[PDB]
């Protein structure tokens, strides 16, 4: 059994969420056959948004957070499909809408052959904290 | 005498800076050898998978010992990520990696906690089923 | 998102495409439309651009103190299993242009597709100061 967020040494590292909205998966399928970009980009936003959620119930508030640090987009990809970075800056934006200038990050997006459950998109980071 | 083994990969088992410990990708092996291939839901099965994931959760912890000079300068595990050779539909990736987080918690403790990812990829070195790499915390 | 973050003396360099001076070079599924050398090259010039997106943030790799992990995805045909052959070309660029401070651990993993059609793409971590 893993945990959701580990801190350690100023540093957070979240694990892989899912496209999930109140607890339910809502987004599988394959981006580029059974789900198209936009709605690839709604479930990045649901995963960067479980991510976010589970950082601030880590650290009892995002007021801790001081800078994002990397940011990993996995991308559930069918035959042909190559829009992984369209699919991963819908959480690219997302934080900037939580975070503001805080949520800057590098990152990675790839397209892997399956996601657990069936999601389409998982993603996973790292961040600095007070 | 493996030459993967003998003169790996251009790249070290086990970088340690700065009081964290990268830990490369450890493919299953035993004694060396490649114990499970294939990709998860066409050439093993979730069992079989699991056995795969344990080995190289072992491999990581003996790497880590290797490098340490013994796991008692292990703080704490930060961050596993597992890669899972998937066939077409197979998506219990989770069910596969958690048979390395639960070797990690039988080893370590209360040390062995991690944050995680399991995600399932194409193809791995050399047919490999399972790869796992991982961050740890040491003294 | 950012090209690289500084914090703490680490830099996340995002991941990197094979560029030519910004232009994509090496597209296809290795094992099929690539053969290994020309996987190799496209490694190659992933890792070229990771260092110059480093370069670029701290004004000069001699504020680099040495690299600390790589990760390595191929496209990757049906049944081509050669990833570290593909990403121990990005390694031996870093050994080239760094020398000891090049060394790394490593991971290699083959992915079903990359952004844009990219043959590879590299991230690494880095330990930087003067």
Request: charged share 20%.
């Amino acid at each position: 059994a893993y945990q959701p967020v580990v801190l350690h040494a100023g540093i957070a590292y979240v694990s892989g969420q899912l496209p999930r909205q109140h607890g339910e998966l809502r987004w599988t399928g394959k981006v580029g056959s059974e789900l198209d970009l936009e709605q690839a980009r709604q479930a990045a936003r649901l995963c960067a948004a479980c991510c976010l959620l589970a950082l601030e119930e880590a650290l009892g508030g995002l007021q801790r957070v001081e800078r994002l640090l990397k940011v990993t987009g996995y991308v559930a990809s069918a035959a042909g499909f190559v829009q992984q970075p369209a699919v991963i800056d819908a959480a690219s934006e997302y934080f900037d809408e939580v975070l503001g200038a805080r949520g800057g990050h590098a990152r990675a997006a790839v397209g892997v052959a399956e996601l657990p459950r069936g999601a389409a998109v998982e993603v996973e980071l790292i961040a600095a904290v007070r």
